[model samples]
Target: SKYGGECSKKDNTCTYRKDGKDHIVKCPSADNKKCKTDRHHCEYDDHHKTVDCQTPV
Candidate 1:
């Protein structure tokens, strides 16, 4: 359900851009993800002008 870190001489890395800022972050291999499954869906927040994660029942 989540994840972070620096872009350096790491084994796995990636370039991520967020919030109108330049970001280069180190990432892990996705061979397998050990996390709980969430029923998350993205929905635009009209009032905040941001995208929100929601789990609909």
Candidate 2:
């Protein structure tokens, strides 16, 4: 989940400032059940929007 910063709804990608410009980091699908802690679902592209926490069952 290295992709983060300035979430974009238009492309569903994270934008970062690098090399004097914006680089969109396309991450894996946000919804990963394999995740053990927490995950961000960027369907809306708002920072810290959707959060899915793992239930320790």
Candidate 3:
């Protein structure tokens, strides 16, 4: 289950964090462009990153 968020506006619109020495997520995007091996497509500051997204609640 992905949170569906946006990265950063900087060069890499992505970030991530570490999960006590492990990544929280490990999945590829539907477009098959980001979240790659090297990129990891983390939307956080640490290894276990997360993409940010907004939903109408």
Candidate 4:
């Protein structure tokens, strides 16, 4: 799926939601799946962590 990123977990399975014109998803294991802007903001605000969108898949 265009919106779904490669799963980063052992299963490489991921979940996603589409908003406006983008894919929103979360990868709990920090694998191939990418964290949406909102997801990133939440994690950054809550845990002071960040996801690198530039990482190669």
Candidate 5:
């Protein structure tokens, strides 16, 4: 996870940040498998509020 940040619940939603911006994702507690295996190293979107694992290269 480049631009590394922790993901945790905020108002019941899972969230992380990059470059001072916040991004939301599915709760890790609810979906442990995806949270672990799906996340790619060094991937993110500086402009968006959320980034998916399948983000286009």
Candidate 6:
């Protein structure tokens, strides 16, 4: 349920501001290494935070 788009040179890559502003990094793929956490191997962008992928029972 996750996806990725090719980042062009024209695209602004993820970066943080020196003023303590937090930037949300989108989970570019299902197995995005950037989204890895201690409990989850992969995570999805929640539009607020990068969190573990949801699974249903």
In terms of TM-score, which candidate is strongest? 2
Ten residues in a row with the worst lDDT in model 1? Answer: 32-41
lDDT of 4 by residue, 1-57 (tens): 133232333333233333444332344445432432332221111143333322343
Evaluated with lDDT, which candidate comes out highest? Answer: 5
Per-residue lDDT tens digits for candidate 6, residues 4-47, read: 22221222223322235543333344553333332222323446
lDDT of 5 by residue, 1-57 (tens): 433333333322334565689666553244432334334322344455343442233
Instruction: List residue ranges in candidate 5 displaced over 4 A.
Output: 2-12, 28-57
> How well does each candidate superpose onto the true structure, as a TM-score?
0.28, 0.37, 0.23, 0.19, 0.28, 0.24
Residue pairs clashing in model 2 are none
Off by over 4 Å in 4: 1-20, 31-54
7-51, model 1: which lDDT tens digit per residue?
222333333344555444333233322111232222333355332
Q: Positional deviation of 44 in candidate 6, in angstroms?
A: 16
Q: Candidate 6 has what TM-score?
A: 0.24
Evaluated against the true structure, the overall lDDT of model 5 is 0.40
Q: Per-residue alpha-carbon lDDT of model 2 for 1-57, expressed as tens digits?
A: 222344444444545544467555553444552233333332222364432222124
Q: Kindly report which residue pairs in candidate 6 clash with one another.
A: none
Clashing pairs in 5: none
Compute the lDDT for candidate 4: 0.32
Candidate 1 vs candidate 5, lDDT winner: 5
Residue-level lDDT for 25 in candidate 2: 52
Candidate scoring better on lDDT of 2 and 6: 2
lDDT of 3 by residue, 1-57 (tens): 433333332333343444434333333344443433333334332344434321222
Candidate 1 Cα lDDT to native? 0.30
Top-down TM-score ranking: 2, 5, 1, 6, 3, 4
